Amino acid sequence: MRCVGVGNRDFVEGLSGATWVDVVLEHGGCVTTMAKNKPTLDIELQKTEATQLATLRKLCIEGKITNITTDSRCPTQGEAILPEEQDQNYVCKHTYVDRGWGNGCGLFGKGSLVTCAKFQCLESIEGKIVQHENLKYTVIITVHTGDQHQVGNETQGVTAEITSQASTAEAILPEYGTLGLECSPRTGLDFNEMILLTMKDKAWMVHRQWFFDLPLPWTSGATTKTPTWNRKELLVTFKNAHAKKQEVVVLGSQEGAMHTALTGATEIQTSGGTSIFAGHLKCRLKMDKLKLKGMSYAMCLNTFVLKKEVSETQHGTILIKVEYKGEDAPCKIPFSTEDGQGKAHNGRLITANPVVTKKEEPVNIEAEPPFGESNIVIGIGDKALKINWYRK
Amino acid sequence: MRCVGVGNRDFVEGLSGATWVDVVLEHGGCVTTMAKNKPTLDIELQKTEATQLATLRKLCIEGKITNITTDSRCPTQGEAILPEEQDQNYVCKHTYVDRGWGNGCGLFGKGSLVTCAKFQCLESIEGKIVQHENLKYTVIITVHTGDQHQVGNETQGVTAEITSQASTAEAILPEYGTLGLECSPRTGLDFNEMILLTMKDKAWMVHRQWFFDLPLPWTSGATTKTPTWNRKELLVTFKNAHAKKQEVVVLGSQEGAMHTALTGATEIQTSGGTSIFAGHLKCRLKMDKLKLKGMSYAMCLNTFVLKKEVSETQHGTILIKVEYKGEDAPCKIPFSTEDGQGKAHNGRLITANPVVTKKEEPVNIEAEPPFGESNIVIGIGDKALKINWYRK
Numbered sequence: 153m154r155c156v157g158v159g160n161r162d163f164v165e166g167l168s169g170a171t172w173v174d175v176v177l178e179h180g181g182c183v184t185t186m187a188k189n190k191p192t193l194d195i196e197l198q199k200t201e202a203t204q205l206a207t208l209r210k211l212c213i214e215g216k217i218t219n220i221t222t223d224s225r226c227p228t229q230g231e232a233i234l235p236e237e238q239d240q241n242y243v244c245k246h247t248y249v250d251r252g253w254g255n256g257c258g259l260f261g262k263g264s265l266v267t268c269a270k271f272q273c274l275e276s277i278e279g280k281i282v283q284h285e286n287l288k289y290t291v292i293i294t295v296h297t298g299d300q301h302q303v304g305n306e307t308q309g310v311t312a313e314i315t316s317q318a319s320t321a322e323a324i325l326p327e328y329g330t331l332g333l334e335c336s337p338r339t340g341l342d343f344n345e346m347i348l349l350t351m352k353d354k355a356w357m358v359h360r361q362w363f364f365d366l367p368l369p370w371t372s373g374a375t376t377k378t379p380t381w382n383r384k385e386l387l388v389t390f391k392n393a394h395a396k397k398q399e400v401v402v403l404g405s406q407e408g409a410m411h412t413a414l415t416g417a418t419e420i421q422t423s424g425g426t427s428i429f430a431g432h433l434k435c436r437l438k439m440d441k442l443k444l445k446g447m448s449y450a451m452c453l454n455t456f457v458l459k460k461e462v463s464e465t466q467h468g469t470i471l472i473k474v475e476y477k478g479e480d481a482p483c484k485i486p487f488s489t490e491d492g493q494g495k496a497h498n499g500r501l502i503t504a505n506p507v508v509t510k511k512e513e514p515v516n517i518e519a520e521p522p523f524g525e526s527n528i529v530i531g532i533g534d535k536a537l538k539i540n541w542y543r544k
Numbered sequence: 545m546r547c548v549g550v551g552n553r554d555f556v557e558g559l560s561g562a563t564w565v566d567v568v569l570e571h572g573g574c575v576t577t578m579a580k581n582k583p584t585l586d587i588e589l590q591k592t593e594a595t596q597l598a599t600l601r602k603l604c605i606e607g608k609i610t611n612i613t614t615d616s617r618c619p620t621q622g623e624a625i626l627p628e629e630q631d632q633n634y635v636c637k638h639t640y641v642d643r644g645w646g647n648g649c650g651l652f653g654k655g656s657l658v659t660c661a662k663f664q665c666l667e668s669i670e671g672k673i674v675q676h677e678n679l680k681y682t683v684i685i686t687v688h689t690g691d692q693h694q695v696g697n698e699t700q701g702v703t704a705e706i707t708s709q710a711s712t713a714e715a716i717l718p719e720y721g722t723l724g725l726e727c728s729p730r731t732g733l734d735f736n737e738m739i740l741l742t743m744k745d746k747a748w749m750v751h752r753q754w755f756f757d758l759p760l761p762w763t764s765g766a767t768t769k770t771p772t773w774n775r776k777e778l779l780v781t782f783k784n785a786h787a788k789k790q791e792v793v794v795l796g797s798q799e800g801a802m803h804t805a806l807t808g809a810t811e812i813q814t815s816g817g818t819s820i821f822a823g824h825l826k827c828r829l830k831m832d833k834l835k836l837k838g839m840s841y842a843m844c845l846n847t848f849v850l851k852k853e854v855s856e857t858q859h860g861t862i863l864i865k866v867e868y869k870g871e872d873a874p875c876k877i878p879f880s881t882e883d884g885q886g887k888a889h890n891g892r893l894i895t896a897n898p899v900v901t902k903k904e905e906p907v908n909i910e911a912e913p914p915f916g917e918s919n920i921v922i923g924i925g926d927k928a929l930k931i932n933w934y935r936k
């Protein structure tokens with residue numbers, strides 16, 4: 153009964169005739185399902201974690217200059233040269249500074265000079281490439297047991313992983329059997345014109361082209377260190393208007409500027425490996441092998457006293473909690489729906505075939521009452537439990 | 545002789561008649577001045593440091609969240625509340641989450657919820673406000689002694705501070721007297737429509753209006769800690785689409801984005817407190833009480849041997865270094881300019897009244913030879929020194 157108490161909750165009907173029941177599992181969503189002589193299921197879609205990815209490019213957003221070296225020749229004696237002009241960890245720019253007797257050159261004129269700066273990237277962006285057959289949605293299916301605490305507990309689920317190519321698999325629900333599902337991963341983002349850009353614990357999804365266009369020093373992705381940052385000119389600058397000495401200057405973090413830019417793009421909020429993509433996944437459940445929780449049970453012959461005051465959910469159902477003051481042991485719970493007097497049936501039951509498993513464990517049931525006045529009859533003849541109800 | 549070797553160098557002539565000489569001292573500049581029977585000065589404008597400033601406001605560019613606290617009531621039981629909502633250190637937002645039996649509220653419906661977060665600023669900007677009558681320009685005046693090392697040494701000068709309201713002040717040059725200057729600081733930036741915005745070791749100067757408009761958490765300037773950051777929401781964001789829990793999230797450093805935004809703005813090189821401003825300061829020096837280095841000397845009667853090969857400066861002068869193999873002691877240096885034969889004077893002498901102070905200290909002299917062929921005659925009769933020269 154996980155879905156119990158979830159805002160976005162879909163109730164799917166069994167279609168009296170056949171078994172299969174197609175669904176639509178979506179993030180922030182949940183779906184209760186029910187069928188004729190079939191348990192009521194609460195199928196949810198937990199995550200849309202992409203398995204392994206391939207990192208394409210790798211942008212730098214925080215540069216730190218180190219080991220500044222320089223060399224300078226006099227007038228009429230060619231440019232200077234540092235071996236650092238050939239290293240790639242180093243960015244260098246030549247320039248011309250006044251030179252005379254004063255500063256060591258017996259000749260007067262514009263001398264030559266070159267400066268270099270070892271570049272080390274602190275923080276950086278990784279632009280990843282994900283595609284269709286790379287995703288593994290995890291479905292959690294909690295059967296309506298009626299268990300004492302089962303009411304809206306996102307824990308009790310029966311886990312099932314459904315990949316793009318293992319498209320149809322089956323879950324084994326304790327004492328219910330096996331639920332086969334036939335899902336088909338459709339996605340409203342073409343993972344062919346989109347890059348999964350990471351950055352610290354976060355992650356977006358943008359255009360290949362755009363991502364590539366960003367003004368940022370990069371290094372075609374690869375693990376275990378020491379890059380050769382390309383285009384370090386977009387973060388490292390050189391100034392020298394007075395022609396005296398040349399100042400080196402990094403640009404400071406682009407984290408902020410990137411967030412600001414990543415406005416309209418959809419977020420993904422990375423979890424430290426896995427990710428939550430919005431993916432409206434459509435299946436079709438096979439009720440076949442899925443058996444029920446014993447029709448071979450007798451009807452309970454005693455009383456049910458309402459342990460927790462009944463409540464209405466955000467959709468138009470009730471949740472009854474009752475304790476059996478019997479001794480019947482395993483037995484069905486007599487559910488008789490009254491239209492105010494006792495002539496017909498207007499409201500139906502959600503928790504299919506509610507049972508008392510142990511005299512000592514309270515039983516939760518969820519029903520869908522009629523409109524306006526309605527009376528319930530949980531039990532039999534002798535002091536049978538009555539709950540009058542007003543709907544709408 | 546500091547100026548000697550400076551690219552942008554200005555030769556200001558005496559205007560034969562009176563004493564005063566107006567000049568124009570500028571960053572990146574240097575001016576050699578000269579007059580009749582007056583020493584040749586080398587006025588330069590060192591720094592344009594603004595004395596004491598007041599911080600108007602103070603924006604924050606990097607936020608760090610801490611001690612996250614929250615409180616949430618059931619449905620139909622009003623919003624939740626925290627004592628932190630009243631704290632200025634905490635930024636808080638209310639929102640609504642699904643509530644049911646499961647998560648502790650016997651009633652079903654949308655619950656109330658408030659979350660808070662102790663905001664703390666790591667790095668922050670300072671917007672100061674300077675106004676003309678605040679700053680002290682520092683002029684360095686080196687006289688052309690002709691001293692052994694003085695050739696372009698930016699050390700030997702005679703310091704002078706000229707403030708906006710200390711408009712005219714005088715400097716004592718050793719063995720030359722006193723030079724008076726009547727400066728009038730003019731600047732091409734209205735320090736009334738601009739704020740000097742610092743940021744780490746850097747600093748620019750932008751429009752008050754713009755500065756304030758910046759999307760940043762501020763705290764009207766004040767020293768010795770513990771701010772009450774105003775409008776913290778411009779860095780802190782809150783998420784809650786699924787209505788389960790509320791996520792706290794900062795925006796990361798704006799350093800980059802700021803630099804990025806500070807493009808057109810003119811820079812100032814804030815160096816440990818004091819700063820450099822582009823200021824074309826215009827003076828007028830009084831040559832009056834500025835005497836010269838003894839006309840009371842006799843002419844040197846021996847030989848001078850060129851100690852360092854003479855060289856042409858970036859403008860069109862020459863720098864003569866010579867040793868006096870004499871014994872005359874303190875004496876003038878007979879400077880005769882030849883037009884190629886000995887009929888007239890085409891070239892002058894920049895280094896005024898060149899003198900040898902000690903037989904054992906070389907003397908440097910700067911002269912301005914005629915165009916084309918020219919011959920120099922330093923000394924008298926006996927093997928006197930000659931330097932053939934070709935100009936243009």
Ligand SMILES: *[C@@H]1O[C@H](CO[C@H]2O[C@@H](C)[C@@H](O)[C@@H](O)[C@@H]2O)[C@@H](O[C@@H]2O[C@H](CO)[C@@H](O[C@@H]3O[C@H](CO[C@@H]4O[C@H](CO)[C@@H](O)[C@H](O)[C@@H]4O)[C@@H](O)[C@H](O[C@@H]4O[C@H](CO)[C@@H](O)[C@H](O)[C@@H]4O)[C@@H]3O)[C@H](O)[C@H]2NC(C)=O)[C@H](O)[C@H]1NC(C)=O
Pocket residue numbers: 253254691692693694695696697699700
């Ligand atoms: C820019 O200016 C600086 C300062 O110039 C000062 O010079 C004074 C003479 C005086 O006019 C001041 O008013 C003026 O401001 C220059 O500096 C000077 O550097 C020189 C060169 O290094 C220092 O000269 C001394 O040289 C001594 C001998 O070294 C030999 O010289 C022989 C020449 O006969 C030569 O044949 C040899 O081959 C060898 O090179 C050396 O022994 C001195 O050491 C000093 O020892 C005394 C103790 O007696 C100490 O008190 C002193 O501090 C030294 O340790 C010197 O090295 C001179 O000291 C420096 N002067 C000062 C105080 O700064 C600078 O060079 C110049 N820049 C340029 C244009 O190159």
Ligand SMILES: *[C@@H]1O[C@H](CO[C@H]2O[C@@H](C)[C@@H](O)[C@@H](O)[C@@H]2O)[C@@H](O[C@@H]2O[C@H](CO)[C@@H](O[C@H]3O[C@H](CO)[C@@H](O)[C@H](O)[C@@H]3O)[C@H](O)[C@H]2NC(C)=O)[C@H](O)[C@H]1NC(C)=O
Pocket residue numbers: 299300301302303304305307308645646647
């Ligand atoms: C949400 O559900 C969990 C787990 O609910 C479990 O209940 C038992 C009765 C089984 O039906 C099981 O399949 C189901 O998953 C609730 O947490 C706690 O569960 C404990 C049972 O494991 C329970 O009792 C104690 O005794 C058992 C052994 O018999 C022991 O394993 C436990 O550690 C525990 O000591 C305990 O009462 C229950 N928690 C509390 C304090 O009530 C959880 O309570 C549910 N949340 C809600 C809606 O309150």
Ligand SMILES: *[C@@H]1O[C@H](CO[C@H]2O[C@@H](C)[C@@H](O)[C@@H](O)[C@@H]2O)[C@@H](O)[C@H](O)[C@H]1NC(C)=O
Pocket residue numbers: 610611662
């Ligand atoms: C904020 O917490 C400060 C540190 O207390 C920590 O104690 C740990 C045991 C754990 O509970 C953490 O969550 C706490 O942060 C504490 O010293 C301050 O008093 C707290 N309040 C302020 C000033 O923010």
Ligand SMILES: *[C@@H]1O[C@H](CO)[C@@H](O)[C@H](O)[C@H]1NC(C)=O
Pocket residue numbers: 219270
């Ligand atoms: C650069 O300087 C560091 C110390 O700052 C030194 O360890 C290193 O040898 C120098 N050369 C390199 C590798 O850049």
